């Protein structure tokens, strides 16, 4: 999955989140045109309570049905004040992307921290199932004091072996703009004057 | 009327695109659709023509969503990963083409271009085509992420074939792409549902025994929603309805972080207190989750119950503050009890 913002001089926004499912999707490349096809079929449930490769379940309401839309986590985002576009963001990540965006709306927010710290602050991620487990990444693993207390509780926590997200956010403030690039990925961010 | 506009992308090239097509006159959705399309170059583990997204749009004060989601192929059954024992076949779903639902992104940016973009069509595929033809400088992390596709694919699928010769630093080129670009350009997404691309991918699936048929492709839309609309301490958050979960998961999310704010303060930011209260309130998104959200045309989706507030305080309270909650009583929140 990818995630790009955009925010126009007449304060049009888009927000797109978009992906093959797992990298480079299925393998399969279109002969005589070039391009890869999707893996995005596990994103339904193949069985009753059975996790796909993100470790969620589902039943009837994502089960496999002859043109259906399998259930995705994607999350691509816009906040206005007053009726003016305020903050443009989305991440890759599966099942993390809308934890992930919740946390960088909480370091935002709640925190008050610039948008560059509310990126990169280390992110976590909890699902109900695998029970009891947080995942975290190797750009910022969980550690020390807080690892041990989150253990003491009796949380488990993994490596899950590929960094939380990769948010691509613009802030605007009246008229000035800001963007930031998650370090865990190679993401880039420009203002254009008009 | 801004100090100007801006660009985050997750390369370089993307980042470029933008800027150019902004500075250009294009509009965001120009700059969109002509970012989607250079990243269908220069980030093939992700940016695609053969996947399927979402746009959240704010354009002259309005909110829009646009699902340009795959769909499951006509021929697709309830139990098709399975094996004769019932038990899930390793990789089916993930691995080749039987792993493919119908592609969605050209048709997907090409309804949010012809609603609302300004610059001509073909203007906004060129960056993407000259990435193709002239090629673009291979990422560190796509050379690691290439070397673990190698070995999950080979030999399974032709991915070495194409993108094999990748390599950090070199420029890659990708002359058939180039082409499949300068169609979709020229005819639109006729090409790709209709034309000579769509005939290339249904050979590949005839080849593979994939499932995706002409009837597949004919029939495949994008589908304008209206946008998930969640209000907090005076802003007002837009993302993804059905069939994302997100806009259900951040509207329970922050609806319930809010409702147990005498519990979040004073605790730090990922202090352990945070995290696990963070991971309390997953889990009964989580719970929701499983039982209740799919395409919203093929059940009856209980969003309103799932999203309105007195629904959110009920599960607040179910937060356990002090210890980790029993998973196995965690339910889903709409389930009659006795």
């Given amino acids: ?194 | 009327t801004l100090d100007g506009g801006a660009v985050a992308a997750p390369d370089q090239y993307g980042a470029k695109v933008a800027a150019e097509i902004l500075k250009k006159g294009g509009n965001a959705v120009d700059a969109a659709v002509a970012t989607a399309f250079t990243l269908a170059v220069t980030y093939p583990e992700a940016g695609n023509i053969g996947g399927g997204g979402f746009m959240t749009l704010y354009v002259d004060g309005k909110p829009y969503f646009l699902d340009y989601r795959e769909i499951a192929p006509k021929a697709a059954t309830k139990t098709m990963y399975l094996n004769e024992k019932g038990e899930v076949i390793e990789n089916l779903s993930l691995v080749g083409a039987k792993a493919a639902g119908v592609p969605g992104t050209v048709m997907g940016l090409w309804e949010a271009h012809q609603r609302f973009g300004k610059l001509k069509w073909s203007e906004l595929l060129t960056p993407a085509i000259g990435y193709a033809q002239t090629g673009f400088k291979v990422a560190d992390q796509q050379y690691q992420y290439r070397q673990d596709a190698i070995a999950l694919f080979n030999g399974k699928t032709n991915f070495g074939d194409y993108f094999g010769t990748m390599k950090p630093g070199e420029v890659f080129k990708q002359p058939e792409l180039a082409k499949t670009l300068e169609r979709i350009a020229d005819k639109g997404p006729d090409d790709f549902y209709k034309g000579e691309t769509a005939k290339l991918l249904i050979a590949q699936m005839k080849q593979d025994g994939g499932l995706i048929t002409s009837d597949d492709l004919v029939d495949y839309q994008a589908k304008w929603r209206e946008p998930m609309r969640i209000d907090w301490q005076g802003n007002t958050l837009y993302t993804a309805p059905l069939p994302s979960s997100g806009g259900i998961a951040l509207a329970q999310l922050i609806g319930i972080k809010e409702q147990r704010a005498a519990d979040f303060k004073g605790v730090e930011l990922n202090s352990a207190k945070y995290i696990h209260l963070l991971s309390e309130i997953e889990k009964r998104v989580f719970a929701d989750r499983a039982d209740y959200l799919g395409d919203p045309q093929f059940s009856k989706v209980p969003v309103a119950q799932l999203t309105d507030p007195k629904y959110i305080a009920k599960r607040a309270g179910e937060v356990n503050p002090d210890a980790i909650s029993a998973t196995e009583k965690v339910r889903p929140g709409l389930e009659p009890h006795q």
Avoid: C
């Fill in chain 1, 1 to 194: 999955t990818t995630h790009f913002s955009i925010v126009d001089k007449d304060g049009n926004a888009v927000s797109n989140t978009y992906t093959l499912n797992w990298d480079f999707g299925s393998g399969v490349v279109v002969k005589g045109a070039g391009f890869l096809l999707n893996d995005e079929m596990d994103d339904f449930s193949s069985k009753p309570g059975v996790a796909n490769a993100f470790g969620v379940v589902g039943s009837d309401a994502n089960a496999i049905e002859p043109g259906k839309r399998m259930l995705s986590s994607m999350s691509p985002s816009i906040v206005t004040r007053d009726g003016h576009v305020s903050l443009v963001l989305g991440t890759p990540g599966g099942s993390r992307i809308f934890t992930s965006i919740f946390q960088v709306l909480n370091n935002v927010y709640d925190f008050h921290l610039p948008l560059e710290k509310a990126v990169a602050a280390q992110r976590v991620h909890h699902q109900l199932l695998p029970k009891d487990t947080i995942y975290y990444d190797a750009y910022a693993p969980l550690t020390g004091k807080v690892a041990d207390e989150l253990k003491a509780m009796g949380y488990t926590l993994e490596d899950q072996g590929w960094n939380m997200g990769d948010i691509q956010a613009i802030r605007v403030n009246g008229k000035a703009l800001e963007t930031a690039s998650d370090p865990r990925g190679r993401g880039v961010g420009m203002v254009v004057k008009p």
